[PDB]
Structure formats: C-alpha cells, structure tokens
C-alpha cells in the first residue's frame, strides 16, 4: 500500500497533447505561490449620525444628517426599541382575542426611507423593495441572523391570548436593527467622499408607520382582523420611540487623501422606481394590465400581488390571510397560493416576453440570474442582466427612449374564488378579499463629483 511515493509519479507520467495544451508552458501560473501586493493604509470605526430635525415617533417623519469630519461613509443602520405589549381582558374581542406583531416587523414600521443631497431626492425605497431584495439576494448562512435582526422569530409573531386566558405572555421589549440599502453600502469600492463633499448637506429621512396597523388583533375563532385600540392593551400606545442611526466611517492616509483631493470622480450607482399600485378585482376580470413609466436603464423588475384586505397584516402576498393555529401559533391555511397565474411584457402590441407560467418567474429566473430563490409565495422576477446582485453593469435597456410598456397579469382561479367571501371558520377568506398589484424596477445611474459638490451629469 504505497503512501504517495510512486502514485504521483505514475500520474505525472501520463502527459499527452491534451495535458500539453491545458497545463505546461513557460507562462503557466503555478499554484502554491500567491503574488502578494500592497494595499492602502486605513482604519474604520462606528459613529452615530447627528439628528437634525424632529423627534422620533410612530407615524411621523424624522431626518438625520450625515456626520462630517470623517473621510468615507460605507455603512448605515437604524436601531430602535419596541414597546412591551400586554393584552387585557377588557378588549373588544373579549376572551377570543389575540395580539401579535405583524410578519416582518422590519421592512415595516418604515415607509419611503430616502437619502438626499442638499435638495434632491437621490434615493428612496420602501417595504416592497426591501422584501423583494432581501428575498432574491439573501446570502445563505446569514438568513437566521437577518431573521433574528428583523423579526419572525416566534417571539414576536406568536399570538398571545388575553391576560385571563392560559396564554398570558407579553411581547418582549427587545431592540431591532435594520441595515439601510444604499449605493455606498452595496460595495466597498463605492463610498461617500465626505471630505470631498463639504458643500452638500447629506440627509436621511425615515418615515415611521403608525403603531395601530403594526399590531395584528386576531379573533381566535372566526379568524377576523380588526384595528387595535388604546384601551385594549395596558399602558396605552407609546407613540414616541427611541431610534438611533449608526454609521461606519473610515480614515485613510494623508498621502491618499491629498492624491484624491481636487479631482473629477465618476460613480455608477443603483436606484429604485416604484410604479403606483393597481387595485385588482378578479371577480370582474381575470386579466390586469398596468403601464410602466420608467426613466433610466432598468436592470431588474420585481412584481407581486399583495393581499390588502386589512392594513394590520403586512407582507401578505398570498391569496388568503393567515389564521391562528393550534398551540398558540400562526399557520398558513391549506388554500394559500400565489394569485398570479401568468405574466407578459408588451411593448406597444409587441409581445417581447410570451405568456409563460408564474412558476417560471418564481423559480427559473432566480435559479440563473440571482444568488437566492425565494422561500415564500409571490415575488416574481424578470432581470435583463446576468447577475442582479452584481454592481458592475450588465445587459439592460433604458425606458426613457422606449415608449411606455405594459405588464399583463392573469389571476388564478383560487384568487378569483377567494375574492368572494363565504369561507368557514379559520379559513382566512371568511371575509371578501382585495388585492393590489405592485411593481418595482431597479436601474442604473451616474453620479459626478467635482469642486466639492455632487450632481447628476447631463447624460
């Protein structure tokens, strides 16, 4: 039993034309020898962005300014503490009533989060974009960490019965963290030159959602959802909240900053354009056509139909609202399928994308042009580029030079039959259901830096 003393020689003796073509040669880069090259000298540390307007509170908008005196900005996140919720026997639903946090507490309690330079809407996003991005480009291994960061950890979404009932647990008052997806946070090679931008006032505007629609009040028997009231829970509703915006800054060498000071810089960034939501009634017609009016070189399109029967429940893209289940847990009814049956792209009566199935967008496109595949119903994608997550530009067409296109979506028979009521107890569709189609587009842009200022060049 030879221990690697002649087997290697026997293998190496098998050298022929194919091996000569593949390996060998005077210019072959052998392994086991990695060419090391020097990098820049720098350091990084976190700071807290200084609040510039208002006081944080649910249902209002507050702005925080980017701190100065730094050298680069490449990371930002928002942390906030949630209140402690305790039900009471004096609620309207009585004994048959449960209170729980909505699914995806983060990506909720926030809408139209924007980043602005002086006076211009540089970037903006909201719940639909956050959900689509975190479902399509989620790095595996970090999924559990992201869930523990945002919610859906069986500690917030588990229904809690009234105080007099057997289940008297209170929702813990633990804090939560949400990273801010931005063009300087996408890649380490893209960062804000704070030192090179002294004449711009960089602001981040966050608009929190009302606490009334962030709490789901579920009937234990009939599975009905009603808005919450102050008298239902102890301590009322804490409208005020403590929210803090943290950032990561990086200091570089004096030679580096002097070399990069006083020069013209070109940056390619990513933005978001959200089409207005379209109300869909499958009872009238099974086909819904929505026009798209986009501006720049669109790279990806994410669309889905959201069940919008109640404002309390969020990120519910299936055709039936969730109901309470045995063991004081939330479960999806057996009739929970994506309402979309098929989709089609039309360029002024020119079918570029044929009428293929919904499962195509659901599975095949993410399998080829994304780093992940969604684990929830809905979230249909069409990407013009080879890699959605890559910051380097790939194949993409601009809609500015292109006359308005349209998306055609076909509702499923399950959707059209769940639109009408009549469902029995704990069926989700006991009440009539309403749906809204939402479409989000991701595109490319160019940002120019000179003379201590930033702006979009004429291109």
């Amino acid at each position: 039993t030879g221990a690697g003393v002649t087997s290697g020689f026997i293998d190496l003796a098998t050298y022929d034309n194919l091996d000569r073509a593949l390996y060998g040669g005077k210019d072959a880069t052998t392994y086991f020898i990695k060419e090391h090259y020097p990098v820049g000298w720098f350091t990084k540390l976190p700071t807290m962005a200084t609040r510039v307007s208002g006081n944080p509170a649910f249902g209002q908008e507050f702005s925080v300014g980017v701190p100065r005196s730094g050298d680069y900005v490449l990371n930002a996140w928002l942390t906030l503490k949630t209140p402690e919720i305790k039900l009471l026997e004096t609620n309207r639903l009585g004994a048959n009533g449960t209170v729980r946090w909505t699914k995806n507490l983060m990506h909720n309690a926030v809408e139209h989060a924007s980043l602005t330079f002086n006076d211009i809407c540089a970037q903006q996003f909201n719940t639909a974009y956050l959900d689509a991005w975190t479902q399509f480009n989620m790095c595996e291994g970090k999924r559990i960490g992201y869930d523990n960061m945002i919610g859906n950890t069986s500690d917030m979404t588990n229904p809690t019965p009234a105080q007099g009932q057997d289940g008297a647990r209170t929702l813990p008052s633990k804090n939560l963290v949400l990273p801010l997806p931005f063009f300087f946070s996408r890649d380490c090679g893209l960062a804000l030159p704070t030192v090179v931008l002294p004449y711009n006032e960089i602001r981040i505007n966050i608009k929190l959602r009302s606490l009334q629609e962030l709490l789901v009040f579920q009937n234990k028997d009939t599975g009905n959802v009603i808005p919450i009231s102050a008298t239902d829970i102890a301590g009322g509703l804490a409208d005020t909240v403590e929210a803090y915006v943290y950032m990561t800054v990086g200091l570089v060498s004096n030679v580096e900053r002097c070399a990069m000071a006083g020069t013209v810089r070109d940056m390619v960034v990513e933005q978001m354009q959200a089409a207005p939501t379209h109300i869909v009634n499958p009872q009238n017609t099974n086909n819904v056509h929505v026009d798209m009016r986009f501006s720049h070189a669109v790279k990806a399109l994410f669309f889905m139909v959201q069940n919008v029967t109640y404002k309390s429940v969020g990120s519910n893209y299936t055709c039936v609202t969730p109901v309470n289940g045995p063991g004081n847990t939330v479960m999806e009814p057996a009739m929970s399928v994506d309402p979309i049956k098929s989709a089609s792209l039309t360029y002024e009566n020119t079918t570029r994308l044929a009428n293929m199935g919904v499962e195509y967008y659901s599975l095949v496109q993410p399998w080829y042009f994304s780093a992940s595949i969604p684990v929830y119903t809905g979230y249909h994608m069409y990407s013009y580029a080879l890699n959605v997550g890559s910051v380097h530009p790939s194949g993409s067409t601009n809609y500015g030079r292109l006359t308005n296109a349209s998306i055609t979506v076909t509702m499923s028979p399950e959707s059209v039959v769940a639109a009408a009521g009549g469902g029995n107890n704990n069926s989700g569709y006991n009440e009539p259901q309403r749906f809204a189609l939402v479409v989000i587009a991701v595109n490319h842009n160019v940002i120019r830096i000179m003379n201590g200022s930033m702006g979009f060049p004429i291109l």
């Binding site: 020689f9 026997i10 003796a13 050298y15 022929d16």
Partner: protein, 78 residues
Amino acid sequence: HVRDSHHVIYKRPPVNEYCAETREDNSLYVPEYCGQNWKNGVLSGMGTHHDAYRNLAVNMMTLRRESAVSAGWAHSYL
C-alpha cells in the same frame, strides 16, 4: 421552353469552399442590414467538413508512434 432544377445562385457559397483558397466569410456570417435573417437553411447538414480539420489531424498525428515512448519522461521520473 426549357427548364432545369439545379440551382440559380452562383458562387456566393462557392461549392469548392472546402479546399484551400481565399475565404468569403465577410458576407454569409453577418446580415447585410438590420432585420435580415440568418443564412443557414440548406447549408446546415455538412458538419466537420473542409480540409482544415483533416490537415490538423495529420499534423497532430505526424510522429506519435515514435514520440510516445518518451512523453512524460521529462515531467515525472525525477
């Protein structure tokens, strides 16, 4: 008053293209104008033809019988 059914297009895909002569790749591989279709309807069906492959095979063979004895002697056995 007379008819034959051989062909009507002359020498655009020249019949003797498989030999060694000047090439004509600048026309039938690219459409002349935008919207023009691709020119492969009957020409497809003759794979791995042209004398280039045969000459390459002959060049690759040449002296394999006498050159196979050493081969990896300069690469493996110390």
